[PDB]
Structure formats: C-alpha cells, structure tokens
Chain length 393, copies 4
C-alpha cells in the first residue's frame, strides 16, 4: 500500500503510488491504479512490475514524475531518449528550455537535410554514376557550359572588341569567332533541352524546377536573333541583361555536389540569423555614417564656402559606403577619416564592426558544421541490411 516497485530491465525502481498518480493518462499513472495486475506484467512472488526497457533513462522519466520538470539526460543520444519517452507516454514538448536545444538537435538537422525508350531517354538527366552514357553526357555538358562561360568572359574583354568604323555610327564590334562558338554551344544546349522536353512527367513541377527555368532563360536570347526596329533596340538592351544569367548554368553541374546541398539547407534553415546580421549591419552603418559625417566637419576650414572641402565625407550616404568597408575590416582606403575626431569615430567603427559581425556569424557557422558532419556521415556509412529482425507484436 503506497509503495510500488517498478522493475525496469532488471533494476528495481521504488516510489510511492502518489508520485505515479501525479501525471495522469500516462502508462505509469495506469500502473498506480488498483487494476494493474492484469493490465501489466507482474509477479506476486516479488510484487514487482517488469518493463523490458533501458533503466538508465527510466531514472530520468521517473524523476519527471517526482519533481515535476522533465529534463534530458546528457549521457544518451537525443534520439534514444526520444524513443524511450515515446514508449513511456511522456510528451516530448515538455522538456525544460535548459535541455531543449540539445534534445531537439539531431531531429532538426535530420528534418532540414530532408514508353519503352522513356527510361533510356531520361537516363541522360539522371545521376552521372547511374550509367556510362550518363557520365559521358555529364562530362560533355560540363565541357560545353565551361566553353559558354569562357566565351562570355572573353566577349566582355577589350582585346576581342576592337573599335571599328561603320557607315555613320562609331562603335566596337565583337569578333566573329566568339559568335561562332556561341552558336555551337547554343546548338548543343538546345539539343539537350529538346531531348529533356521529350519526357516531362509532372510538367508543373518541371516548370517549377529552377534549373530548367535558368536553362530556358539562358537559351532565350540567342534564339531571339531570328525573332528580332524601335522595340528591337530595347529588347536587345534587356537581352544583354538576360544573357547576364548565362553564368548561372554552372549550378546545373554543381547541384550534384554535397557541400552545396548542405549550404542550401544551412541558408534555408538560418533565416533568423541572416535577418539579425542584416539588421545589425544596417544600424551600425547608419549610426556610424552619421557620426563620421558630423565628426569630420568639426575641423572644417572656415574659408571654404562649402561645409566640407577637405574630407571624403561630403554627405551621409558616402558614410554608408565607408562604414561597410570599415566594419567588415575590408578597408580599401578610398575614403578614410582625416581629423582627430574622425579618427576616433573610425576606431570605434572598426571595433564595433568586428563585434557585430562576429555575433551571429558563429551561429550560422555552427549550423553549417552540424549539417555538414551529418551529411558526410550519412554519405560515408555503408548501406545497412537491417540486421535486427524485429519480433512480432
């Protein structure tokens, strides 16, 4: 009467029926009731109920019954404790904030990290290692993306844009070689795009796929040569700006990399820290721009009609630029303080920038480290054969 002995995995836990009776609806509560002999495993020889569970954590569960606050035992992996409290009926959203960030850590990382010829057609878009043709087409598309990017970067150069005379417009024209190489790359990319269009299951998600969007936007300007006078000039002007995306085709290749998927998950999972960093920088930039603009006017020469003639800080927005360059410890040197007051404000800006940049960035860095370790583990670990054949219920 009032003393009940729980036998968990061969370790006898003793407690009063009242302590079990505190938290109702849970399995131990039902144990405390007078109709428990039939309900649960029990032997009249020793008057102990037997549960075939880890005892080392049942200590902590029973502690939640005793004191009233549920904590995570720091000597067991989060998932192990999760499964134990799941069996005992304790709700997992009860743990104290002192032990919540380590408990809900692996599960946060885990959640963040998560007709006959049609297969052979689609095998050109599957993983490279999934076939030999796949690994060849992947190498070829890599070569052609690189050639496109190099053509772009060389097209913007001077050596390949000699000035010429047109009869009466004077301008610089691009070499023919570049246009020919661009045509070749467009032919290859359009062939690939048409072959991919051949098989397009769930065309809504195919259009929602950012990669295919980038491909089509990148292939639009060249194919607009036939389509393209007054509107034609504006559309060409925006067509150069569209061609600006042609470097974005490199993500098609780098998507199969692991570190980049981890980086995408890190970014999408650390929005709060990015917003925090941007707010810190905005406040710092504004405050220090105002401070330096006013400091640099103290020593202004009275003779000059303008308020500031000898200082780079002729207004506050210029202060914004200097404040960013100085807080990130970049320090180009295009504009710097030139008055003792300006120098004081500048030293404060450098130190405050180091601090308010080093506040949230370590949070973000720890997120990436955790996700990368987990992803590399899940990649390295050989595929299991589920050695444990579970017993029937």
């Amino acid at each position: 009467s009032e003393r009940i002995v729980i036998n968990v995995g061969g370790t006898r836990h003793q407690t009063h029926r009242s302590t079990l009776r505190t938290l109702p609806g849970t399995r131990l509560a039902w144990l405390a009731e007078p109709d428990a002999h039939s309900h649960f495993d029990y032997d009249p020889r020793a008057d102990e109920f037997f549960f075939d569970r880890h005892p080392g954590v049942f200590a902590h569960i029973l502690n939640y019954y005793r004191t009233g606050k549920l904590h995570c035992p720091a000597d067991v992996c989060g998932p192990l404790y999760e499964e134990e409290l799941a069996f005992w009926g304790i709700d997992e959203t009860d743990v104290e904030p002192c032990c919540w960030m380590t408990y809900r850590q692996h599960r946060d990382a885990e959640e963040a990290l998560d007709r006959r010829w049609q297969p052979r057609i689609w095998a050109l878009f599957e993983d490279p290692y999934s076939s030999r043709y796949a690994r060849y087409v992947a190498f070829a598309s890599l070569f052609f993306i690189l050639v496109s990017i190099t053509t772009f970067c060389l097209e913007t150069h001077e050596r390949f844009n000699p000035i010429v005379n047109k009869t009466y417009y004077r301008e610089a024209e691009t070499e023919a070689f570049l246009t020919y190489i661009e045509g070749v790359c467009v032919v290859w990319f359009t062939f690939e795009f048409l072959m991919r269009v051949i098989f397009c299951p769930n065309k809504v998600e195919f259009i929602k796929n950012s990669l295919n969007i980038i491909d089509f936007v990148a292939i639009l300007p060249f194919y607009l040569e036939v389509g393209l006078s007054k509107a034609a000039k504006d559309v060409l002007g925006f067509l150069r700006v569209v061609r600006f995306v042609r470097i974005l085709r490199i993500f098609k290749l780098t998507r199969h990399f692991v570190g980049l998927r981890v980086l995408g998950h890190t970014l999408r999972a650390s929005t709060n820290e990015f917003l925090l960093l941007i707010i810190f920088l905005a406040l710092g930039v504004l405050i220090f721009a105002t401070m330096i603009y006013y400091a640099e006017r103290i020593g202004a020469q009275p003779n000059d009609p303008s308020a500031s003639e000898h200082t780079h800080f002729k207004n506050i927005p210029i202060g914004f630029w200097w404040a960013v360059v100085t807080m990130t410890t970049l320090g180009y040197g295009d504009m710097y303080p030139q008055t003792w007051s300006g120098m004081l404000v500048g030293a404060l800006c450098a130190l405050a920038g180091v601090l308010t940049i080093a506040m949230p960035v370590p949070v973000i860095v720890n997120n990436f480290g955790m996700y990368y370790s987990l992803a590399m583990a899940k990649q390295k670990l050989p595929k299991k054969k589920k050695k444990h054949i579970p017993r029937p219920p």
Copy 2:
C-alpha cells in the same frame, strides 16, 4: 551499528554513520543520529531509510559527504542537480571551481534574460500583434520614422543644397520640399506623443524610459522654431547637433526585435570582457605607436632639418591611428611603414593585433550564442498547460 543503508529511489546506498555525521545540519546528518526511526521513513524489515529521489545524483551528494568536495555530475542538467542538492540540504555555493562555470550557466543566462477608454488609448503603444489598430499604427509609425531618416540623409546632400546669394551673406540653403516633409513628420510624431502623454501611469518611469526621452529630444528642435538673436545662433548651432539624434528614433521600432534584446543583455552581461578588450587595445596601440615612431626615424635622411620628412609617422599619436588600423587588420593604406625597421614593427603589430583582438572576442561571442539559443528556445516552445498536477504536501 555504524552501517546505515540509504534507499534512494530503489537503489540502496551503503555508508558508515561517520561519513553522514561529517557535514552537520544537513538532512543526512540528522539521519545519522540515533533518533531517526520516527524522523524519517524507515522499515525495520530491511533496516533501510527510503527517499523518493533521483539516485543517480544522490551518488554524487553522498560522494561530497565521503571525500569532502562537492562536484557537478556532468550527465545531468544544471537545474536538475540544483533542485536535488536543494532538497538534500547541500549549499549550492560549495561546488568546486572545476565544475562551477557549467553548473551556474543556465541560471546565469536565465537571470540575464529577465478611465473607460484608457485601455484603447494605451493600445496604440502596446505590441503590434496585440490588436489590429496596434499593427496599423505600428506600420504607420515605421513609415514615418523612415521618411524622417531619409529626409535627414538627403538634407545633408549637395544636390539638395544649391548655393545661393543672400542680400550680404553667401551660403547654401536647403530645399523647401525637405522642410515641408519634416513639418509633416513632426506633426505626426507630435500627435503620437500627445496621445501617449494622455495616459502616463508611473510618470517617473515614463520619464526614465529612454525611448520617450529620445522622442522628446528629437521633437524639441523643430518645435523650437517658434521659440527662437545672439543666443539664437548658438542654440541653432547646438540644434543641428541635437537633430543628430533624429536617427535614434529607429530603436523605437527595433525594440520589439528579439536579436536586439539578446544583444542588449549580452552587452550588459559582458562588461568585464569589454573592459578587457579596451585595455588590451590601449596597451597595444600605445606600445606599437612608440615602437613604430622610433623605428621609422632610424632611416631618416640627415640632410632634412626636421627629424622626419619622408615618413607618415611624424609623431606618436599618428602612430595611435596607424596602430588601430593595423591591429584590426583594417589596413587603409593612408599611412604604412617605409623602412625595414618600420616593416618589422608593422608585421609585429599586425600579428599582435590579431591575437589580442581574438583573445576576449570569443568570450563575448559565446555569451551571445548562449543567450540567443536560450531566447530562441523560450520563444519557440509552445505555452505549457502544466500537465504535472503536484501532490499536496
């Protein structure tokens, strides 16, 4: 006789009566005395006293009785151990320094993180989400603060300050548009301020509130147009300097952010590390300024009458500026060593600066990380319903 068996949560702990008798006044000490059968729960069948507590930590408490030094078991959350030793009577200020910083960690973070129409009137100052009018007034005050700040930053620009001729004073005058927008913003802010003044409970703390102080100081210069000749020029000169605070109205909006409250708590809780960083920087700056000023004179040309003509380091304070810019790895390039001795001193300055900046900043960064994790946890965790109905004493 001399062998007493303590039954804690179904685990029998055995020890000599002397070990219990060492630390007097505590509950176990009273257990050791010969008048313990009535005082505590005890059965003559097994000669064991029964305590319904976590046994895994009673091991460590009894260890304090045995050896004489109290430690924190690194496998339980600090608050759990705190509550257990609180029950057993052990003083919490006895733990060894090896295990004090982790024990008193959550409790440090926790402490650092902590007439009919009058409600509807005050509802304009309450949280935005607390109503719909609140969220609208909040959006409107955001718009008007941003307009005030943009007017300020554009007022300091040249494009909006064209030079003019006044008849005989020559100066640049600000555009009328800016003055009109400023008047509009002042009208709105004064309306808000008067409505807030309508209801001001505990007016002493209302005046002590830094936000209301900033509001009044920011609204004083405009309203001084009517009040405002010899004293008037000085008060206008200081009025521009007062208007310098008008950018501080952005804290009124950003106070409801979480990262900023965490930053305020971090700053206020890491004063020692800030003083340490400032002392390190002062010693480094002084020492390296002297060293570089003397190094740069070794190669001074004898012909020149001045001691230093070819060096930027004409004196030591200039050295202060260079030493800050160089120790923070900023490196503007306005002044740099130009003598082999100067270059040696410069390399030492760069390395020593990296080191004495990276000494205390990680301490501060860890503080912010801990406070931010705890605050984000306490924000995310859904409000509890206190499932545990405590038993009557």
Copy 3:
C-alpha cells in the same frame, strides 16, 4: 521460461528470451538458446549467466537488442565502447548516424596520425638526438641551408647586381662573392648527398622520397655549369626556374618538427573541405565579378566611345581579381567600386565572402586541433611499461 537474467559484472540485467533471439549469430543470441548451460558460465542456484564485463555499457548493447538501433553512450570513450561491442559480437558499423561522428573520432585521428660501418654511415641521416655526431651534422646542415637561402635572396637584389658594360651586350652581372658562397654550399651539399648515396637500402623508396628528389633537383643546376650554345641559353633560362626550388630545401630541416607533420596529416585528411572551399570561392568570384562588371556600367558616361572609361572594371576577369581581394576581406584598394550600384554589389561581396570563407574553414581548423592535441598527448605521455600482465586465455 522466457525470462533470462544476465549477470554482467555483478549487475543483473533481466530480459525476455525473445529480445535476445532477435539479433541472431551474436553471443547473446546463443545465450537465448536452450543449449546454454554448458556453453556459458551459469549457476543453477540463481539461474543467472555471469559475464565479467563493464555493465554500464552492456545496458546500451542490450538496448540495441530491445529497440533495434545501436547508439553510443556519450559517457564512455569511443575506444572503450568499441572494445565492449567487439566482445559482445555487435558489428561496429551499425551505430546510428546521430552517434557515428563522435564514435569514429579517435580511431580516425589515430589512423591519420599513422657492412660493419653502414650503421655509422647512416647515423648522419638519422634523428639528431639519436647521437652526438647526428646533432652536429644536423646543426651544420641547418647553417648551410640557411646560407644557401640567404645567398639566393640577396642574389635577386639590386645592390648586388650593378649594371655593367660587356663588349656588345648590356646587362647586370651578379657579384663574385655570391658565386663563391654558392660554390661552397654546393660542395657541402654534394658531399652530404654522396655520403647518403653510399648507403641506400630499398633504392626504389629512396628515389620515391620527395626530400632526396628535392635535393637532387636543387643540386642539378650548379653541377650543370660544366655540362653547359643555342640549347644552352634555353636550359639556362629553365635553370633559373629550377634554382627556384632551392628554397624548398628548408623542408629537410623542418620535417622533424611536430606541428608540420600534424599539418601534413590535416591537409591529407581534409581534402573534401578543401575542394568545398575552392568551389565556394569559384562560384562567389564568378558571380560577383559578373555582377560588379554590369553594375559599374550603369553610371557610365555616354560621351566616351568605350563602354567603361571611369571604372577599374573594364572587363570581367579584372572582376575576378577584385572579387578575391574583397571576399577575403583583404581589400588592397587597387580597384574598388565607384558607382552606387557598384557599392551595393561591393558590400554584398564583402559579406558573402566572409560567410562562404567561414563555412568550411572551421571544419578544417577543428581537424587540425584534434590532430594536434592527439599528437602532443602521444608525445608528452611517458613510454609505458605495460603494468597490466594479461591473464592466459
């Protein structure tokens, strides 16, 4: 029947025969079978099988039998748990990914960190502390390597390369003193190399040794003076480029240092993070170069025939250089944005560079820290005498 009591190190673990029978082939499975009395140690008095093992981890092993997922107890060193599960028959490649990176940590670090006168001849190449002649030859080779390096660095100077007139070729010739010192150093190094050639066991690995390769490549140019007209000029031109390696002889001395061996192991063990860092930098550099080149053309003056006359960003590759200098927070200041659009892109470049540089570098830094702590431990720990005399099987 169905209730089996395992006695591990004096702690009785109780469980059903089914739970043991789940995972077959393991020792506990064989325990569950009806032919277990003879097979294992067992007493009919208490009906318990006795195993003389750590019980605190047998809890977790039996937990793997019960639930079906094997975890690492965070309260025991990885090697201890490894040895226990090795005894019990559990495969070590079954642990959950939540507890794999800490389990397989020490073993990863450990694996990464791992005729009469012929002995006296070879004693000149052995460790310096291994003899007295060894420590003397080591000091002497240090002196001579340093003299060679100083001769090199001074040979490239102007003070030692005065212009002269040759009769009709005009050029600058190196001082004779440098050539004499070089000859002396070559004599010493060739004597050392010949003495080492005297004894060369496993000559294949001797040739595979990078140090001996560097020695021979460094000693080739001088000895080619006798060997060395049209081909002679090209071979001299490449001989200067070969002599460029003469600074690599410093690794011969620094190989006996500990931090450098740890750094070599860190590099070779963190290839993935290096590839990740290089990919991040390549994407960032490409993207930001394109963005800044296009941003800086928005404000281009229309009068100029060239597209860009007032900007340092005349093409995209120049953008590559600026993007590296700006993302590493180096910021020389040779080229910087000069247009409001350029300044926006520049601020984004600085922040994104800090982030994508601080992503993988902490992983690499943690690797080096772990390897260095382990190597310093293994160096400090005095050589053991294996106090534990193991019992015969």
Copy 4:
C-alpha cells in the same frame, strides 16, 4: 573460489579473482589474495568486502583491471576521478591518450594559474584595497604615470618642437613646459622609489623583479643630466633610446588587473603554439615571396634594361613584406600584383595565409578562454569556511 564480490558504496561488483590478480601491487590485487579477511572490511554473512567509495567510477577502475586499458569516465570531473584512482592505487599516468587531454585539463590550468614602522612603509606598495593610504597612493601614481606618458607623446610632436637658430647649429628644441613637467614627475617617482628602497626584504628578488628594473631604467636618463663631451653625445643618443622604455611604466599599474595575469599565464603556457605559428608564417612568407617575385617577371617588358621596372616586386625581401601584409588579410595596398600570374599567386597567398593563421590561433584562444574562465570563477566564488569537518583517520 575465484568469485569475489566487491561492495562499493552499496553496489555489488562481482568479478573473478584472476582479474583482480592481474595488476599487482594495487589494493584490489591485495584483495584477491587469500589473506584478505583480516586486511580489509568483510562480513562472512554475505561474503562481500565493503569499500565506502563512489561506485560509479569503481566500475571504470575495475574495467581497467578487466580489459587492460584505463579510461576516464566522461561523466565525472577530472579531479573527482583523480582522487578516486588515487585511493584505489591506480597510477594516473596510465590513462589512454584518447582520454588524457580532458583528464589532465583542470590540473594543467590550476598549475598554470599558480622595524615598528616597516609595515606602514611597505603598505604603500601593497594592494590598493588593502588600505586607504594604499588606494590613494595608487591613484596618485596612476595620475603621475599618465602625466609622464602624455609628456612623452607630446614631446615627440611638431607643435611643441618649433625650429630655432643657435649661434652655428640649426635644430629644433623642445618647449620648457615639457621639461618642467618631466622634472616634477621625476621628483615624484624618485620619492616613491626611495621610500620603496627603505624596505627591501630579499633584495636579490627585489632586483630580479622586472617592475623595479623598469622603474630604475626609466628614472636613469633624467638623473643622468647631472652626470653628463664626446662620450656625452653617444650616451645622450642612447639615452633617448632608454627613455623609449618610459611607456613601460604602465605595467606597474596594470599588473593588478586580472585579464593581464591570465594573458601572461596563457602566453607562458602556449609557447609551442607560438613557435608553430612563427614557423608557419616563415615558411609561407618565404615561399610566397619567391613565387610572386618570379611570377611578376613573366610579363616584364623586354625593352627595359632592368629585369623589373613596372613591378613593386623588384626583389624577394620586398616579397617578404608583401607576403606578410597579404597573408594576415591586412592588405595595405602599397604593393600588389599587376600581372595575371602575379594575381594568381596573390589569391593563393591570401587563402593560404587565412588557413595557416587560423590553424594554431584557435588553440591559443582556447587556452586563454579556459584560463580566464577558471580565474574568473576563482575570483567570484566567496571564500569558503570548510563546512566539511573531516573525520579522524
């Protein structure tokens, strides 16, 4: 026979006599012998030996007996485990390298952190808080040290060194005010120094005290005015260089600070990491200086007689300066690559510098963090009254 039951703190540990007999000379070994009933506490009723010790760690000690390798249980503070194994007789220098750096951590930090009127005379050198006169003399010496330093820094300025004509030597002379203030400060410091000389116990250590050395060296130049023609000019020239130490008197005041004592202990305890950092920087600087000097000559114009006319990298030592400025991400911009090859080498230099600077600096930073946390703990913790009255042996 062969089965011995050890009762440690009420938990029965069972093991074979052979396992105890493995490690000889230790207490458990003596337990295993047949003459153990009299030697140790033992009851024939239960055939168990009773030890009044923590059982949770006796598990691990007995594990050392069983397997043969001693590990540290990660759930107990290092000192607790130290004291337990000290009682059991296990040598502490046996623990495995996997668990040595965490075991020997607190003890490393701890070791690193460690006639009638004569008392009133010496009370002027004792701690400021130790009296009222002490706190006053401390404030006064602070004021006078600051005045000396300000006089120094202003003496090197131009405003206070106007050029004058002496009749025939032309030079700039220092203002009289500075000399008068210097005389006053020297009078005060000499009075303090004489009063301290009054009482000088253990005069050998008084002379070995670096602070008194600095005081005497700083006070020597002024007092040499009376002592001080040909030798006089050289001694004055070195006297300015001696006066260079006058800024070192600030350590007299800052010695009572805590962060500085922690920094001194950190430096003295991290010599290996400093040597490692310096070696890394020397190799990096040498290698990259050579690489950039050779890279920048590829694009050298053939017309120029000199090898390099258009590059800042006219020789290799200049490369040393650039390599330091670039590896520390300082980047003054006085010299930077101007050739595509030079730019490649420069990008490599920036990245390699970040890496080989971030390798050992985190080790040093962790040392400082550990020492600072321990020192702040030992400072905060109130002085104990040793509640535990130990029992007589």
